[PDB]
Structure formats: C-alpha cells, structure tokens
C-alpha cells in the first residue's frame, strides 16, 4: 500500500518561500496523481493544486501563482512551494494521492487516499526554541504527567513509554503564553497500586528544533 511521508514542521518568516516534500513508497506505480491541501487552524480544507503521473500541474487560481508543484521521479518525491508567505498561510499542509480508484456508469472517480501526515508551517518572525520538560508527579486512580514549556513554533508531540502506554492519556492542546511561547501538558491516569513499580516516561518531540527529550515521572 503506497504511503506518503512529508517533511517536518517549520517556521518561515513572512515574505519567504516554503518547500514541502511528499515522498511515496510501497505502492506499485512509479508516479502518482498527487494533490496538495491545506488547513489553517480552526478552518476547513482548502485545495491548492495537483500534479499528474506525467507531471502536468493544475493550480487553484485563488493562489495567484504562489504555488508551484514539482516532481523528482528519482526519489519518488513531490514538492509544493508556496511563495510570498503571510501569516494567513499558517496551516497544516497535506499531500495525498488523488488517483482513479473506481469506475462505474461509464465514468471514473478520483478521491484522496492515502494522505500524508501533514506539515505545519508557521509564518512568523519569531525564532525557533525547544521546550523544557518538567514532571507532574502523582488509593484508587492516580494522575501523573509532563509539563512541556516554552517552545516555538508548534507542534510538540508527546507519547508515553514510546507509545506503548496510550490508555488514559490526555495530551492537551498547546496554549500560547504571553511571552510568545507555547506550553502544554500531557497527563495519564494509572492505577495507584502501580506507582513505584511501573515506569512512566514521557517522550517529547519538537521537530522544528530537533529536540527529542525523555522524562521519567516518579512519585
């Protein structure tokens, strides 16, 4: 099953250009109909443009030439470049395959599947900054967690024990502090009898700053 993997999140200064990559692997074809869609925070999906298996491009007029999709067949990679960035361009950028998946009634039907994992592009002149990670230390049910403070830009991901612990986890949406930096907590409820026996580690990843931190949370 083909899978699409995108480049990581980054902050870009207003006026600059961003280039997001989409790498395909695992399918049977050498090139695909790739489309690009974006989603600004709290907004809908907005289609941007697409490229065919023989590298013909189509762009929504609304972008006014600011979007360019190119292909590198040697690496099975598609690039979307969005130029003259303004803060309204802050959004998750998605690639997807938009291939013909079904024909019936004399017609053929395209749809988006699979999707890339998305790339959050933050348009801002603030600098990247990695997070500090502090523990939220814990009869019946206990709560424990990790406080992930003072990073920029979004996003941060948090897992517990590498993702082996998912039940009872709540990773809160980030909040923008008045310092201009983001903060967030991830918590998990566990049996209180497990404390001091079971190890709990939060894995914090801020790809924009290449920060991968683990924090053991003990009582």
């Amino acid at each position: 099953q083909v899978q699409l993997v995108q480049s990581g999140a980054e902050v870009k200064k207003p006026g600059s250009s961003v280039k997001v990559s989409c790498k395909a692997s695992g399918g049977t074809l050498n090139s695909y109909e790739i489309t690009w869609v974006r989603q600004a925070p709290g907004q809908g999906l907005e289609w941007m443009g697409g490229i065919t298996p023989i590298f013909e491009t189509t762009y929504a007029q609304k972008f006014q030439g600011r979007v360019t999709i190119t292909a590198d067949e040697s690496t099975s990679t598609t690039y979307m470049e969005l130029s003259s960035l303004r803060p309204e361009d802050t959004a998750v950028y998605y690639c997807a395959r938009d291939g013909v998946r079904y024909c019936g009634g004399g017609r053929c039907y395209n749809w988006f599947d699979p999707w890339g994992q998305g790339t959050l592009v933050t348009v801002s002149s603030a600098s990247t900054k990695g997070p500090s990670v502090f523990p939220l230390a814990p009869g019946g049910t206990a709560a424990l967690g990790c406080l992930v403070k003072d990073y920029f830009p979004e996003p941060v991901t948090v897992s517990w024990n590498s993702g082996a612990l998912t039940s009872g986890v709540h990773t809160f949406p980030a909040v923008l502090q008045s310092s201009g930096l983001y903060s967030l907590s991830s918590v998990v409820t566990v049996p209180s009898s497990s404390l001091g026996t079971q190890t709990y580690i939060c894995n914090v990843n801020h790809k924009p700053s290449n920060t991968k931190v683990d924090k053991r949370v003990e009582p």
Binding site: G44, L45, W47, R107, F112, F134, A137, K149, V187
Partner: protein, 213 residues
Amino acid sequence: DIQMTQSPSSLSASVGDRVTITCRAGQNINNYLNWYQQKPGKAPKVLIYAASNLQSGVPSRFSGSGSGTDFTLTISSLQPEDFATYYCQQSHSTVRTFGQGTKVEIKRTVAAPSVFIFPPSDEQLKSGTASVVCLLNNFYPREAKVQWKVDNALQSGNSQESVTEQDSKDSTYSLSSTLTLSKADYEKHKVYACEVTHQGLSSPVTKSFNRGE
C-alpha cells in the same frame, strides 16, 4: 471554480440519533462527489465515493445520496466515535474543491470531573518560575469553573486553561488549569488550591496542597 456549500456548520446529537448533512454544488457535478471524515489531530479519511458508495471498512450506518447539485451524508445511528468534522469534495473538475465542513458533536449524560492538583517541580523552581497544575478529568458537559485560591486569596489573571476535544469512546472532556507564578511569589504563600464547579458536582470540589509539606 465549482463552489461547494455545506450545512449546517455544526450539529450535536445523542448516540443513536439520525444525523443528516447537506452539500450543494454551484454547478452540476453528476455524481462526482466524495465525503471525508476528519477526526481531531488526523488527516481526513474518505467515507463515501461517487456520492453514494461506502468505502470498504466503513460501517453501514453511513450513507450518501444525491446526483447533480444536492447531496447528503446520513448517519443512521450516531456513535461516539463519529465525533469528527465531515467534508464534501467534488471531483468533476480538475480543480478540486471542498465544502466548508460540518462539525458533529455528541450529547451524553452529565459526568463529574475527577480533580487533581500538581505542585511545581523542584527543577522548574530552580529556573525561577512555578507552574501549578489542576486537572479535571473525563467530565461532561464542557462548561466548568476553575478557581485558584492562594492562602484563600482568589487569584485572577495568572492562569490559563486548556480543554481537550470530545473523547471518541466516552464523549467526555478533560481540562487543565495552569497557575503561573515567580519562584519569589510562589514561596511567599503556603496553601495552593484549585476549586472546581461543574453541573455534575453537587457542591464545588477543592484540591489543595501545602508548599513543601
């Protein structure tokens, strides 16, 4: 170019209810119409193709109909995991276009929060700042009042909240409240308390600790 108009922009219904969402195209698009489901933090997933066909693996409570300009997505018996935003998308023209989306929210019975308080870590205090964290876990409805008291002094303007999206299994929310102080100010007081008011609690619940103790 082909404008899609989706309505309503949001709805809420109880488990088991029938839910209907509408998509209107600005021009005839025959049956070149897809519906996607997007859950929080995820890419959208196709549910319906060619207006009325279920993607394999999708439960049969979903259906679609329409040909021409008017299309509907129907959930015959809403389930908690159906909490999501739904989008229509036309594939008639090479320039693809999306409807604005419909957010589907789940009504459930009242559930009281479990309340937890966390003092700042000794590591954070070395850096000069104290974060005190109050957790409200697995409650419904989302409306809740969280008040910080320091030595029984009601705090104002020094805390921020975060609230999760509805849980895909039990349709509850969780919320955090973070009180942020200087190390200096934090060490001038002893009692740290967050007090919680919620429809599922007969009287407010207070969790507190004493600095150091």
